[PDB]
Structures are given as C-alpha cells and as structure tokens.
C-alpha cells in the first residue's frame, strides 16, 4: 500500500510538556515519525510520497471556523503578548461557565483547549496542516480505489474536537480523512480508533453526525486521559443517535478480550453500512508501552490489520499515538502487514 | 476593629505556579500575610488573635463535599502515584464531556479544577482550613456585635467554586464567613467583591441562594482572568434570580469610574436587604499591581473602605488578592482606616 508522509512534521517540535507537575521535553517528538517510517520501508512499504498542497475547504467541514483561525495566529499572539515560554492553557471553561468568547490571547488559549499538558509552538500551525494533508491525500488514493493506504500523520489528531486542542492534537486528521472520502462520494464512512486513548475528539465532531459512524477502543477514562470521554453510555445525539460506540476497557487488558471488542465494533460498523473504514491507529496499546495499562504484544498487531481488512471495504489507516519505544516501528509495520494479507 | 490571623497559613508555601507558559514561583506567597500584618499593626490595628480550632459544618453548606474530599488527601494520592512535580491539572471537563466522576487522581484532580496555574503542595489543605477558621471567627465577632472586623485570610478563596479550586484558592473564606452569619441568625447577607479578579468562584456558590447577595467589579472578564465568568448578564438564576450584580471594567479604570460602580453595588446591597456585609478584599486594583489593569491609588482605599461602611451594617472584610509591590499592606490598611472612620 502507499505510504503518504510529509517531512514538515518536523515543523512541530515543542520544547515543552506538561507532565508530573513539571514542564518535560515532549513525548510526542519527531524522531517518532522517524522510527515508524524506517519500520514500514523495511517491512516493504517503500512507495512513500509527499502530500500534495490542499486549501482549508474539507477541514473546515469538520473544525470549528474560529477554531482554525484561532490556531493559525495562536503563536504569534502568545509571543507578542510578551510571553517567555510556549503557549500553555491554564484558565478552562468548565462547568457553570459563561458560553461567551475571550477577546485576548490569555483566555482564548484556555477556551479552544481541553488539555494543558499540550503547548502551542512555533510552526504547530504548519505541521498541522501537512500532516492533515498527509490523511487528505491518503483519503484520495481509496477513493481512487485503492484497497488500503497509510497515512503517517504527525502531528496525531484524534483529541482535537471541534473547536479544541489537545493531547498533541490539533487538527483531526482521521475526522479530515472521513470527511474526503464523504466529499469524493462516499455517503457512509466509519472510523475505528484503536489508539489506548479515546478519540474523544474525533467522537465530539460525528456525534451529531448520522452519515458517520466512530467506534473506539480504549482504557476506560474513569482511569486514563482524556478522562472525561468515551464511556460506553455514549451511542451519540441527536441526527447523530446511534453512530458511536465505545469500548472502554481496564488494567491488564489481553488480546483476548481486546480482540471481542475489535470484532464487536466490526459487527456495528458493517451493520451501519461504511463504504470505507478510516482506522485512527495508535499503537500506545503496546504490552511495553509505559503510557497505557493494555497488554498486547507485537504479533497481535498483524492479527489487528486482518481482523480489520477482512470488513471487506477499503481502509486507510491514519497515524495517531504510540510512546517512543524501540518497537513503534515495529509495531505499526506489523498492523500494515496484517491489512496487506 | 479586631485582626484575626493564622500563623499555619505559612503551611502553603507551593514552590511553582504556571505562568507565561513557564513554571515561576508563586505570586501568592507567604510573604504577603506578612508584609499585609506588619502593614495593619504598623496602623494602629494591632489586637491580633488566632482562630480557634472549627469543624466542617459550615464549610460543609457551601462547597461539595466530594471537592472537600478530594482536597484533604489530594496531595498524598499525588505524590503516591510517583509524580515528581506538584499537583497540576492538564485535563479538563470543558464543553460537551461527560458529567461522570473519574476514579483516579489524574482524572480527579482536573475534575475538580478550573484553573491549571495552581498547583496543590504539601500543607495546602492545612493553610486552607486555618485560613478558613479566621474566616469563621472573624464572622463570629460580627455575630456577636462588632461593627467591623478584619480576616487576614491565605490562601485566599474567591476563585474556589462549589466542587472546584483554582487562581490560588481552595476555600472559598467568603462564602463561608457569609453562611457562618446566617447560622448565627441573619437571613439576609451579602457578599461585595472589590478584587481586580471576578470572584466566580463565590457567585457559583450563591448563583442560585436567594438568601445571600453578590456584587463583584472586575477586570473585564472579556480580557482578564478568569475569563469565563463575571459578565453584566449574570444576574443569578432559579431560587437565586437577581441576586447577582457584575460590574466588569476596562483596562485603566481609575477610582473616578470604579467608586461609580462601587455606590451602585451598594445601592443594591441595601434594596436586597443586607443585614452585614462580607467584604472580600483584594488590593491588586493598585496601579502598580503588575497582574491588573485597573488604576487605584492608596488615598483611593481609604476612601473606598469609608464608601463601604457608610452602607450602615457590620462588615466583616476578608483578604483575597494583591501581589508583588511592597504597597499591599499599605493598601490594606487604608481601607480598614477608612472603614473603622
Ligand atoms: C510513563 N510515562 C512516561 C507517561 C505516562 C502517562 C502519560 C499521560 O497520560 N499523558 C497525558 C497526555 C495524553 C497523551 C495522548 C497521546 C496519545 O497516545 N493519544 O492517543 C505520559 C507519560
Ligand atoms: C505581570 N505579572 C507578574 C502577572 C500578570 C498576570 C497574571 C495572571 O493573569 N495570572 C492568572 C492567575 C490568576 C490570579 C488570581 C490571583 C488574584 O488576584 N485573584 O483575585 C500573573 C502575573
Ligand atoms: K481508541
Ligand atoms: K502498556
Ligand atoms: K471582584
Ligand atoms: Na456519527
Ligand atoms: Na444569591
Ligand atoms: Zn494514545
Ligand atoms: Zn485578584
């Protein structure tokens, strides 16, 4: 399958992370997207290409306008308000909160944030874009018709919700993807995030959205980030009721009840109808993992790809989180091998 | 007028706070009860006594007790979890998330938080209850007969919201001191807010009690923290509808436009009935207060402490904000020489 990557990811490289009480350098850096590319090459995946240059028409179907405008500037704001250090929310509108807007920089940060561990640097803006680029034209080749493609995305994406940043995220890519491949003809699509995390904000974009369907499997949030989303009482809203399914999961997780989850969401995805499967992969679910508590090792990745390929619709797999681990590579690869058969 | 002040304020002694996306020590330092003492001594207020030893009852009839909870053993939990750093919140319950509680310390802490620049260090929950215990006493003494009576509170507490801390407060003083009036028999009190900062945090607690009444002028909340709370339009809601009067302001409000809203704050109070008055004092309205942008002279809190007690009921005032210059306890006392007339 083709492998899209755009080496201006590199563009995100933040000094600084939230973590522990302190500011730490982030975990999320580039010599990820480093790790996972050789990985692939070597796994066989050589047909590597650059994005293409893309507007903001697809993006802003799924963002927030203000949203975006807001990420665009944020730097620039931040560094002329006189700021010595990376932009970093710290005032939220939580619960009993006036809906109204902040003007200045100070309360905006906080407003479009869900999450203050991620701070805004120089060129986030841009890397943003390119890795959304990356999911766009990875959308492109299955609507062109290929039967699977990947999408090496940095930053990751699946914790910016409409109008929010987040756990690295800014601009969701898989959101990005789905909405493409609606825009090339499409009229279903779902997304399957099998990241550790809850997508939540993938799952705060296509909540309301009927022609989208997102299932995600994840550590249950009463006991890990994003904390506040993706319990299973949460099936969706409105013209969206019935589009979301989650499948949170504790401590020691093995592939063996992972895997009843996996088939459980497959089963609802072909029942809703997908004409195509974005698959928001993460593979943070790793035994060796330090951020996550599943057990899942290197093999149950191949087992993962196939299990997913055999829907029987064309997938494209987007590129989320995973720690730094000498196996990331490794790891991802063997999720493309199982989905090339 | 009697002082009431606690030498176990200095048991919150947090080494770092957020700011300017970097990790500064704290604005709300220890030094300030003192500089803020040796001011009001230095003035001729100096029968200072400390607080007696005071339950959880009145505390217990205005913030959750789920918040309480949380606070005593949040360090402990913290610090047993293997973090390096203080307590500090990154995720938060912003829009469209869910209503549930998480389990762990993580989760819990940004559940109940609003603020990420106020980290929670060993002895927070110590300096809280002592400074609430001068709080208590200090509405004792009114209770009792006294036309006034000064609580050298800190922390201070207008910031802390039913279930949530944050802008360096974890117990709102006020609120308590408000409902220790009504259980020594007042049905009628009100709470008038002279900080730069809007007390969010107090008028959560009474938004919907039509017994107690909350006046607050502020930075514009527009452009000055905490910025999601403290516009004109909040009037108060349900069993509490009009008992809540905002008046925000713009960037160099000298007295000339601030007494304004002061004599109408006032106005309000006495229409509602008000059988005492707490009044939570910050004194970072100062010119040269480098966290605000308002423009009071000394002279002016004098002036303002005499407005004030010309209402005609006892008043209790509290000490909420005020940073840096040595001016503070300067301030401070001005406004008690004002008051005591
Ligand atoms: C042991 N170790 C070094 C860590 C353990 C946990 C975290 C974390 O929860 N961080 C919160 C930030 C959210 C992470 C989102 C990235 C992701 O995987 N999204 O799916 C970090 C480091
Ligand atoms: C120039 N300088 C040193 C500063 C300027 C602004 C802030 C601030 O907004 N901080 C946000 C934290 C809220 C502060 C609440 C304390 C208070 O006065 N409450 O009423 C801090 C420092
Ligand atoms: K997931
Ligand atoms: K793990
Ligand atoms: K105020
Ligand atoms: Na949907
Ligand atoms: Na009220
Ligand atoms: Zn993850
Ligand atoms: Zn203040």
């Not at 929010?164 to 090339?184: E, P």
Request: glycine share 12%; charged share 20%.
């Amino acid at each position: 399958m083709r492998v899209i990557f755009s080496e201006d990811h590199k563009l995100r490289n933040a000094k600084t992370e939230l973590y522990g009480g302190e500011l730490v350098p982030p975990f999320e850096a580039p010599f990820r997207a480093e790790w996972i590319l050789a990985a692939v090459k070597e796994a066989g995946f050589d047909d590597v290409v650059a994005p293409a240059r893309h507007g903001l028409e697809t993006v802003l179907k799924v963002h927030d306008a203000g949203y975006l405008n807001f990420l665009e500037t944020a730097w620039d704001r931040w560094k002329a308000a006189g700021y010595k250090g990376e932009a970093i929310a710290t005032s939220f509108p939580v619960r009993r909160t006036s809906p109204r807007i902040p003007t200045d920089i100070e309360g905006q940060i906080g407003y479009y944030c869900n999450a203050a561990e991620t701070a805004i640097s120089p060129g986030t803006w841009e890397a943003a874009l390119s890795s959304m680029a990356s999911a766009i034209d990875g959308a492109d080749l299955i609507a062109a018709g290929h039967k699977a493609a990947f999408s090496l995305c940095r930053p990751p994406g699946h914790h910016a919700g409409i109008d929010m940043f987040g756990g690295y995220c800014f601009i969701n890519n898989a959101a990005v993807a789905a909405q493409r491949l609606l825009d090339k003809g499409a009229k279903k699509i779902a997304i399957l995030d099998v990241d550790f995390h809850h997508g939540n904000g993938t799952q705060d974009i296509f909540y309301e959205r009927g022609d989208v369907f997102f299932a995600s499997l994840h550590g249950d949030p009463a006991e890990a980030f994003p904390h506040f989303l993706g319990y299973a009482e949460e099936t969706g809203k409105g013209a969206g009721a019935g589009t979301t399914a989650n499948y949170p999961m504790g401590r020691g997780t093995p592939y063996s009840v992972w895997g009843e989850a996996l088939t459980d969401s497959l089963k609802r995805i072909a029942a809703f109808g997908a004409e195509a499967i974005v698959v928001s992969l993460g593979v943070d679910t790793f035994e060796q993992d330090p951020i996550s508590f599943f057990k899942l090792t290197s093999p149950d990745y191949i087992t993962m790809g196939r299990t997913i390929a055999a829907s029987g619709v064309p997938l494209l797999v987007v590129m989320e989180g995973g720690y730094g681990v000498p196996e990331i590579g490794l790891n991802v690869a063997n999720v493309l091998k199982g989905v090339a058969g």
